[PDB]
Motif scaffolding. Structure first.
Motif, mmCIF file in Angstrom:
data_model
loop_
_atom_site.group_PDB
_atom_site.id
_atom_site.type_symbol
_atom_site.label_atom_id
_atom_site.label_comp_id
_atom_site.label_asym_id
_atom_site.label_seq_id
_atom_site.Cartn_x
_atom_site.Cartn_y
_atom_site.Cartn_z
ATOM 1 N N UNK A 381 40.727 28.504 -95.027
ATOM 2 C CA UNK A 381 41.385 29.303 -93.999
ATOM 3 C C UNK A 381 42.777 28.709 -93.698
ATOM 4 N N UNK A 382 43.826 29.396 -94.139
ATOM 5 C CA UNK A 382 45.185 28.863 -93.998
ATOM 6 C C UNK A 382 45.554 28.584 -92.525
ATOM 7 N N UNK A 383 45.064 29.417 -91.621
ATOM 8 C CA UNK A 383 45.392 29.226 -90.222
ATOM 9 C C UNK A 383 44.649 28.057 -89.574
ATOM 10 N N UNK A 384 43.430 27.806 -90.037
ATOM 11 C CA UNK A 384 42.694 26.624 -89.588
ATOM 12 C C UNK A 384 43.289 25.357 -90.209
ATOM 13 N N UNK A 385 43.851 25.490 -91.416
ATOM 14 C CA UNK A 385 44.588 24.388 -92.023
ATOM 15 C C UNK A 385 45.830 24.037 -91.184
ATOM 16 N N UNK A 386 46.566 25.058 -90.724
ATOM 17 C CA UNK A 386 47.548 24.859 -89.620
ATOM 18 C C UNK A 386 46.986 24.141 -88.387
ATOM 19 N N UNK A 387 45.885 24.665 -87.854
ATOM 20 C CA UNK A 387 45.220 24.069 -86.713
ATOM 21 C C UNK A 387 44.841 22.590 -86.969
#
Lengths: 463, 143
Positions: A381-387
């Motif tokens: 999950x690219x956005x959880x990788x951000x998170x």
């Protein structure tokens, strides 16, 4: 320990399909290959030697079948298949490896016939449609003026590193040719002006125009993908290099060896984050030795930073002006054992940018002296990788089984249920993807999927 | 229609998009408005230019849809530049409106047009000395 559960019986292809493919042992030593098509027609394609079978991805029913013939009286091999729709027709672009060289075909699913074909000046390794129509229209304005004069464009790459952009001549409705009657190309080196004058002559001589990109020769291209959102053709090489070519300027914007070194680029997948402060998006690149030793399989996340976003007249958004491209995550899946990538699939949901963006990697690990392979489906999950603050790798101790931005599923129930049938490909159903901060880890994602086997399809749910 | 991008200050060209206009091209720009994309029959959209031409009292509304961030793929979307009521009246496609009496036609036109127009028209008539002869002056109604 997330484990997929099987939700259907094995839905077998019909006997006629099984029998046709099993004539693998004459045009031998033919490997049966199969992929879900990327489009919106619910197709899966299987190929063995010269035989192509198109089946219904959810039922296994035979939809279309064709046995290609060789222009030089010797069976070709169906090497590459891509979905391709044009006008009001639904089709496949097909790359055929022949004893001499290669042929690119346009195969019409409506009538199960080849309708256009051209002889390629090399041995094809991959093909990719760029666009399915020509004419002056807002919908082609993102392409270099010289391509806009063409009518449908397919990129074709070869084992010596040729990159060919071929006019599909979809404006010519008087020409219906099969693979045996393939037309020659007129190859122009680079990208000329005065295309119309050239084209008209070229087609009066019964040939298709081809632009060959000025690009070094000598190293095989192993992967090829047009990234719609950045207008870039991604060209992966057998030596681990990745090129990005801008299809507006026709220039190579990026070219570097992936961090796995001299290992072929086997697949790519594009992702866009929900909120990024500098127009970054992402290209995964998979390096794999699966077609040789089977000892190396690694994932490489490239962050592409652009200077702007452009809304096109078409309504589509385009990243424009590549400012940097750098690897920001690396995961080694392998590198006795044998490991191979089965599939690599990006899923994005839009509410501008998607609010959900995941990449699904499916791979199989065979241990020598171990009959049943393990099969894994991993969801990034690219956005959880951000998170998670963009870590560049798994930390010490950290495991895929327990990672906040990666979910790991075991498909071993599928293996048990289907043995000794081989999994050829896995498709996650986008429409099925469904959901304290830990809760938004991708482990909580539910989804359905379908495995393509050598003898049928079977459905699973991950929950 | 040239269209580039502003950025830092720098203006940078992208493409010239011509117009699709014939009958000599005798339309004048009235107003244009570049804005966020619409819900059109083509999902491939990035931006939308609304354009209003004029040629006499006849108007023309168009929407230029640009597909991608390159301003090289686009598509012109036209519209009907007369209302249904007007088209039906012009082309004698109106089956519903009651026929018959001269005063019936009076009610018909009054109700159709509205008082502002109907009275402005009756103003223009008397100025030009066109005066209703009797209840049944069909020659008048025609006017």
């Amino acid at each position: 320990d997330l484990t997929a559960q099987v939700t259907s019986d094995l839905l077998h292809f019909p006997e006629v399909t099984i029998e046709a493919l099993g004539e693998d042992e004459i045009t031998l030593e033919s490997v049966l290959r199969g992929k879900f098509a990327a489009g919106k027609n619910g197709l899966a394609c299987l190929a063995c030697g010269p035989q192509l079978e198109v089946v219904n991805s959810l039922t296994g029913e035979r939809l279309s079948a064709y046995r290609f013939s060789g222009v030089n009286e010797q069976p070709p091999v169906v090497l590459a298949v891509k979905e391709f729709s044009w006008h009001k027709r639904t089709g496949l672009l097909i790359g055929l490896e022949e004893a001499d060289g290669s042929v690119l075909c346009l195969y019409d699913l409506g009538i199960s016939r080849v309708v256009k074909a051209v002889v390629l000046p090399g041995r094809v390794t991959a093909i990719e449609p760029i666009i399915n129509h020509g004419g002056a229209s807002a919908s082609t304005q993102h392409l270099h003026p010289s391509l806009r004069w063409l009518f449908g464009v397919a990129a074709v790459v070869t084992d010596v590193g040729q990159i060919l952009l071929i006019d599909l001549c979809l404006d010519d409705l008087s020409c219906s040719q099969n693979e045996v009657e393939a037309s020659d190309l007129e190859v122009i080196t680079g990208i000329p002006a005065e295309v119309p004058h050239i084209r008209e002559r070229v087609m009066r001589e019964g040939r298709h125009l081809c632009f060959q990109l000025v690009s070094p020769l000598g190293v095989a291209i192993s992967t090829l993908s047009y990234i719609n959102r950045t207008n870039q053709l991604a060209v992966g090489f057998s030596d681990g290099y990745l090129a990005l070519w801008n299809m507006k300027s026709m220039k190579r914007e990026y070219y570097t060896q992936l961090e796995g070194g001299r290992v072929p680029v086997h697949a790519v997948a594009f992702q866009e984050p929900e909120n990024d402060p500098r127009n970054c998006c992402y290209l995964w690149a998979v390096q794999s030795t699966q077609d040789s030793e089977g000892d190396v399989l690694s994932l490489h996340l490239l962050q592409l930073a652009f200077g702007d976003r452009k809304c096109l007249a078409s309504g589509q958004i385009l990243y424009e002006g590549l400012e940097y491209c750098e690897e920001r995550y690396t995961l080694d899946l392998a590198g006795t054992s044998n490991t191979k990538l089965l599939g690599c699939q990006s899923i994005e949901r839009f509410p501008l940018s998607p609010d959900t963006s995941v990449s699904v990697f499916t791979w199989q690990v065979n241990i020598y002296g171990q009959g049943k392979p393990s099969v894994y489906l991993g969801l990034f999950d690219i956005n959880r990788w951000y998170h998670a603050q963009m870590p560049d790798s798994l930390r010490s101790g950290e495991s895929l089984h327990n990672c906040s931005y990666f979910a790991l599923w075991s498909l071993d129930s599928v293996v048990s249920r289907t043995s000794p049938h081989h999994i050829l490909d896995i498709l996650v159903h986008e429409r099925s993807l469904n959901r304290p901060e830990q809760f938004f880890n991708p482990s909580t994602f539910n989804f359905d999927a379908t495995c393509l086997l050598d003898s049928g399809v079977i459905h699973v749910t991950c929950a | 229609f040239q269209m580039g991008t502003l950025l830092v200050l720098t203006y940078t060209f992208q493409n010239n998009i011509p117009t699709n206009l014939s009958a000599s091209a005798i339309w004048s720009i009235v107003d244009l408005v570049l804005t966020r994309p619409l819900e059109l029959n083509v999902e491939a959209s990035y931006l939308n230019l609304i354009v209003l031409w004029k040629s006499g009292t006849a108007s023309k509304l168009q929407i230029l849809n640009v597909n991608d961030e390159s301003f090289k793929n686009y598509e012109w979307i036209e519209s009907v530049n007369k209302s249904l009521v007007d088209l039906q009246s012009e082309h004698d496609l109106d089956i519903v409106t009651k026929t018959g009496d001269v005063e019936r036609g009076f009610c018909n036109l009054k109700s159709r047009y509205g008082t502002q127009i109907f009275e402005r028209a009756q103003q223009i008539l008397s100025e030009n000395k066109i005066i209703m002869a009797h209840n049944e002056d069909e020659e008048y109604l025609a006017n």
